[PDB]
Symmetry: D2
Amino acid sequence: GFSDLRDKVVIVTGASMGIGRAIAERFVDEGSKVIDLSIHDPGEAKYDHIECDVTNPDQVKASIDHIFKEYGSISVLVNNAGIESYGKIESMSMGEWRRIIDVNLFGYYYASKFAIPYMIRSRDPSIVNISSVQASIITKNASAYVTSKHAVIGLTKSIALDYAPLLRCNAVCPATIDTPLVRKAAELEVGSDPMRIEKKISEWGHEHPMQRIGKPQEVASAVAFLASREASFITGTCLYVDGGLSIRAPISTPE
Amino acid sequence: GFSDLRDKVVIVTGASMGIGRAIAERFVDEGSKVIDLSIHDPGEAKYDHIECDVTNPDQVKASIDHIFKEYGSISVLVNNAGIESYGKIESMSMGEWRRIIDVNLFGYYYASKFAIPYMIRSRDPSIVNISSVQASIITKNASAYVTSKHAVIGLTKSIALDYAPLLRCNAVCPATIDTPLVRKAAELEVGSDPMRIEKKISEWGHEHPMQRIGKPQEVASAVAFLASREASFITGTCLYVDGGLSIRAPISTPE
Amino acid sequence: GFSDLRDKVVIVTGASMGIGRAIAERFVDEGSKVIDLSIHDPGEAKYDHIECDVTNPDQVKASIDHIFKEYGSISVLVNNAGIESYGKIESMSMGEWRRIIDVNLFGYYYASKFAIPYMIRSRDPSIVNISSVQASIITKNASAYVTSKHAVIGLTKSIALDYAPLLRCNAVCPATIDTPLVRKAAELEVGSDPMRIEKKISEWGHEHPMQRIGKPQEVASAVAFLASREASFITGTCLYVDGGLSIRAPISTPE
Amino acid sequence: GFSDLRDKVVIVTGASMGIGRAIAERFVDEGSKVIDLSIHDPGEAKYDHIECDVTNPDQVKASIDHIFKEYGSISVLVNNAGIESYGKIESMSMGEWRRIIDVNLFGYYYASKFAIPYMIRSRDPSIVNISSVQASIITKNASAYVTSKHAVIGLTKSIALDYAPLLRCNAVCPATIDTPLVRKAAELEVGSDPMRIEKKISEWGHEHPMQRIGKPQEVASAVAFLASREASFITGTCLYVDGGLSIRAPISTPE
Ligand SMILES: NC(=O)C1=CN([C@@H]2O[C@H](COP(=O)(O)OP(=O)(O)OC[C@H]3O[C@@H](n4cnc5c(N)ncnc54)[C@H](O)[C@@H]3O)[C@@H](O)[C@H]2O)C=CC1
Ligand SMILES: NC(=O)C1=CN([C@@H]2O[C@H](COP(=O)(O)OP(=O)(O)OC[C@H]3O[C@@H](n4cnc5c(N)ncnc54)[C@H](O)[C@@H]3O)[C@@H](O)[C@H]2O)C=CC1
Ligand SMILES: NC(=O)C1=CN([C@@H]2O[C@H](COP(=O)(O)OP(=O)(O)OC[C@H]3O[C@@H](n4cnc5c(N)ncnc54)[C@H](O)[C@@H]3O)[C@@H](O)[C@H]2O)C=CC1
Ligand SMILES: NC(=O)C1=CN([C@@H]2O[C@H](COP(=O)(O)OP(=O)(O)OC[C@H]3O[C@@H](n4cnc5c(N)ncnc54)[C@H](O)[C@@H]3O)[C@@H](O)[C@H]2O)C=CC1
């Protein structure tokens, strides 16, 4: 593991399930003091939790102010909370489109804006933003989602350039990962039959060169690496955790 | 010139000055029927002008309705209206940060959303979005602006993927171009002194491999190309009009 | 068309068939004085032809020296000659692997190296290199080919940075285009049955958002644009002519 | 540390100094069995050394055979050996240009080609190729070098796609790192004066957002991560260790 993470204060948004829960648990295993900021109670967890809607800047600010007072510092912020709904620009309501940008982009902007002043008071603070492989290669009927994930890359670069060398900021770009969001996406296409759901997920996995979809813990490893001093000269980039998806052209060749 | 642009209905947002004006003027020269949607009156102009705030959907929708009813079709939409103000994520007010996103991203979203249903009924529909070289290499203290330009790329790819093959959507990514926005940028940095602003602009030009900043007409050429049938198999991409800026590392080598 | 190309001397390598022939014909239509450098006689063509193997630097140099003496100048060089053979790094002989790099990369290096001294003696000379969508998203069993196309992008950037602002150098990155090379690739997979060949090509076309493969003339339009003064502030970039292929993730979403 | 690297057989080319040496040393610290394949003797070293010219396939193949027979497996191959000399495409001799391609690209090709059959029989095989930040943003008068680094990216993606899921292949893209190669670069530019070389290096460091050049150990950290099981769903990508250099536009903004 990354020894330097032990005892450091780490805030992870949307860590009550999926990738965020995996990230929180990894930091706990690294010995960090972890706090989840989300709108769902993970229940019995080894990490702290504060009810917090990332689209509410006042609640985000209050939650972060509280964490700094309670723990004494903030060394790492992992922006992960995100949602996805589907629809063509002509079918999705303007309200839903905006809501996706609000959670996926503005949530990252608010958490970063309020954590940074505190983070720079710590040694070598680091922010890791979860974007998507869709910051490069995209899916259909995902206008708002795709737009928000591209936006996250811009925010990441900006924070990195604006606060270097004191604080680093990077993003992780995962392809399909086994999480509630993805299980839900499969159900929305094939139903609740666990047999048909596995077939759908297997199909997606076969589209990735690695021949399977990723596991939450695999994204967590990338986040821990970027948050650690092992990535001391890495800032402003996106580390793709995509099983090779973003480099594959879907054009057959003779075998 | 591109003979297919003749008589085509072309909408350009933010065409009362700078790059937008040069784009409208180029399409007028190509024989197109051009309409500017902007908050400022360009005054004496070879193209039509409609007072329109791109952040007001009611106004955007009505302007587009007026254009379709009056002209009978809409073949090209160039989203160009944009603004920029500076500040680190810590200094800029949340209101100003949101405003930049509203004009630069939501303005493109509203115009695209309301124009698309009309465009898909028209001939060779094409949307060109003006992003920035900053969708790749970025500047300091420009968090909102940079985020918005990356967001535009995502919006561009999604429209391209969701409406191909009938409609194409591409972006143009300009580096430093001689416009009022750039003149303002220099002034905000070196003051109102005309000869000093001149020096600042020259400096920026020398940072570009082409050894000068770009001209609005050079961006217009790229836009006209992408809007034309000449770009019939080009969709979802950003054409960089940056004088080589995005491929230059600021590291000297032996001469 | 691009009026500025009329009467200018344009050299196109590998213009005896496919994309190269399409490029040569487009420049002829633009009024340019075109010369093909290839190892195949296009037969009755409106452009000049000189037997020339691009892997032979002496023959390349002699052919270019001859063109400058005969025509008086060289304004545009289009590096297009290229080959593709398939094989895993473990199956393809080292000789064949090297041969692909020799034609695809060294051919571009030689033609550029010998044409440049002459080109800088003309006004606003331009080099256009044909790379591939595979400079970004790649196919299986195409090690040497993929490597060579990535290499072409590096050479393109280098030439652009080294000779700006006098001479510009850009690349075109096509996805699947209807040419002998592609028809051959299909046959290597399904045989000579025109019915089965069309089905294979149709399959590839459906993988592109545009729902069809591209036409040689579509790549030619991009080359003409980059070679012209319409692209005066464009250098060091690759213009993707891919029907949206490079921005598509092969992961289904609910519809 | 990464516990899975213990006892794994790791081959590092060009590990007698600079980045290569730091990489070998890091793997030795992780408990791996490390062998350096390079033309120069590192002398007193914690890892094994074998005199090997990466451009000589007979020698590369024999060295890899000796390693597999002696150690019983090969789990990681780090291609790092590389050279750089300067000159515009017009001044550098063709022989020197070809040599840079031979060492920087063919060396990676030979080592990968001969190691792969052994690696696929081993545990968690992973290949890490050292490219450069110049696979994106480039320097002047470095045609061969830049071309070779872009080529390495293509080679990386193809090995990744052709051998997934059993073997992973990624690249690391460093910006300026304190090594003899960089010391030589400065000397060739500002002379042998030690304090002037110091000034030149400082200047380059200040061009990086992190405000300093990188350390060889920082590149080694990225390599160890990508070679480890922690990067189990990461393949075909380049991890940029550039202190933010590739995302920085050299254009000033108001402060
Ligand atoms: N699952 C996948 O394949 C991929 C996921 N991602 C990204 O990874 C992140 C996590 O995704 P998943 O674990 O899959 O989804 P998930 O739905 O399982 O987890 C989302 C978490 O976000 C929290 N959340 C949602 N809206 C919130 C709000 N307004 N305020 C506070 N918390 C809120 C939820 O409480 C939950 O804990 C997201 O940013 C997602 O876009 C990126 C690429 C792929
Ligand atoms: N000037 C440069 O170097 C670059 C400009 N760009 C982009 O090109 C576009 C044009 O930029 P410039 O001509 O330089 O700037 P500019 O300030 O000279 O022109 C902006 C135009 O936007 C219109 N506009 C602003 N807010 C509006 C609103 N709410 N509703 C309707 N119209 C509105 C204005 O009326 C004006 O005509 C922008 O999207 C900008 O981000 C991208 C890269 C470089
Ligand atoms: N067809 C496609 O889908 C794509 C083609 N490209 C590139 O476009 C270029 C043209 O491709 P195509 O027209 O499809 O292939 P093609 O095989 O039809 O045409 C190749 C041309 O190269 C010439 N040539 C080959 N080896 C030569 C040598 N040693 N010296 C001189 N001339 C030589 C041939 O005489 C021929 O005229 C190549 O660089 C190819 O890699 C890139 C992406 C896609
Ligand atoms: N130093 C820097 O800032 C950067 C270095 N890189 C890359 O990192 C790698 C290491 O670079 P450095 O340590 O800086 O340079 P270096 O010159 O200090 O080390 C090069 C190593 O390559 C070995 N080598 C050279 N030719 C060889 C051959 N024919 N056969 C076997 N071994 C050979 C040498 O013995 C030496 O140990 C290279 O691939 C370089 O292109 C990439 C970006 C930046």
